[PDB]
């Protein structure tokens, strides 16, 4: 049903990747010359620090300029609320789409639907226009939206469009400012696909760990100061996997790119994205 205080759909995780893109392309809106994927959910709180106050603001303007889609979690809590925030202000000030994919079972309130309206267990940001709720298992605590997101990204990457000036397939860029939890797994899975080229922001997180890196012993010293509570509470069975995953990312450093907090020069985001592509 539609959402208004705006469309939300509920689909199975096993659902085919193509059908999603076909529906979006055929009548809702025109073909996308660009796409951006943002990692989020590692920390519910998002700190509006001076560094983050500029990069995403420039990125959203770039997306509007290129007509790029933005793929975020879609919840009011976190970075996606500000990605939504800024998107709405751009419209207030040619059209920018914002797709948010979350877990259907992870949603506290679900209303069947003309269009059912709910006004304020995860809450959903109003700014994002389209919301996709994956339901592989009902009331399933574990998050499954990441798998469907990865499948959709893989399909879109293989999609071929003659438009624009990018050979064959349309461009894809993954922005990695959030750290740890689903962020590292998402980066690993995306890098597994050749087409995606990840980008790491300058914030203080495990993304900062990856930025600093560019065996297990070499990287063990890293992330200790950045995430003390995370490592201390994390069991050894989880810490070992966390440090194992970093090797896969560092194996292929050519695809990834680093945005350094230092450069005060404007449009750093554009330079980073263009270089990565």
């Amino acid at each position: 049903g539609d959402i208004q205080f705006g469309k939300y759909l509920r689909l199975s995780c096993d659902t085919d990747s193509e059908t999603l893109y076909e529906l979006l392309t055929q009548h809702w809106h025109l073909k996308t010359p660009n796409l951006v994927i943002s990692v989020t959910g590692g920390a519910k709180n998002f700190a509006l620090k001076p560094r983050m106050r500029k990069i995403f603001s420039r990125l959203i303007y770039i997306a509007q300029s290129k007509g790029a889609w933005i793929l975020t979690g879609g919840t009011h809590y976190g970075l996606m609320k500000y990605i939504g925030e800024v998107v709405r202000d751009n419209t207030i000030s040619e059209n920018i789409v914002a797709i948010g994919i979350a877990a259907w079972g992870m949603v506290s309130n679900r209303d069947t639907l003309f269009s059912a309206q709910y006004i304020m267990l995860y809450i959903l940001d109003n700014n994002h226009t389209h919301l996709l709720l994956v339901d592989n298992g009902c009331h399933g605590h574990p998050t499954v939206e990441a798998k469907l997101r990865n499948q959709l990204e893989k399909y879109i990457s293989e999609r071929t469009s003659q438009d624009s000036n990018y050979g064959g397939k349309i461009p894809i860029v993954c922005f990695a400012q959030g750290g740890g939890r689903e962020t590292l797994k998402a980066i690993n899975t995306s890098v597994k696909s050749k087409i995606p080229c990840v980008v790491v922001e300058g914030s203080g997180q495990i993304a900062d760990v990856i930025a600093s890196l560019v065996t297990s012993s070499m990287v063990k010293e890293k992330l200790v100061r950045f995430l003390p509570r995370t490592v201390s509470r994390l069991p050894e069975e989880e810490i070992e996997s966390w440090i194992k995953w970093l090797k896969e990312i560092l194996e292929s450093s050519h695809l990834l790119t680093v945005i350094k907090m230092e450069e005060a020069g404007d449009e750093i985001v554009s330079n980073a994205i263009s270089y990565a592509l």
Binding site: L9, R10, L11, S12, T15, T19, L20, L23, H27
Partner: peptide
């Protein structure tokens, strides 16, 4: 129409 299409997406 659109209503028929939407039903297919969920399956």
């Amino acid at each position: 129409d659109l209503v028929n299409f939407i039903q297919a997406n969920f399956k």
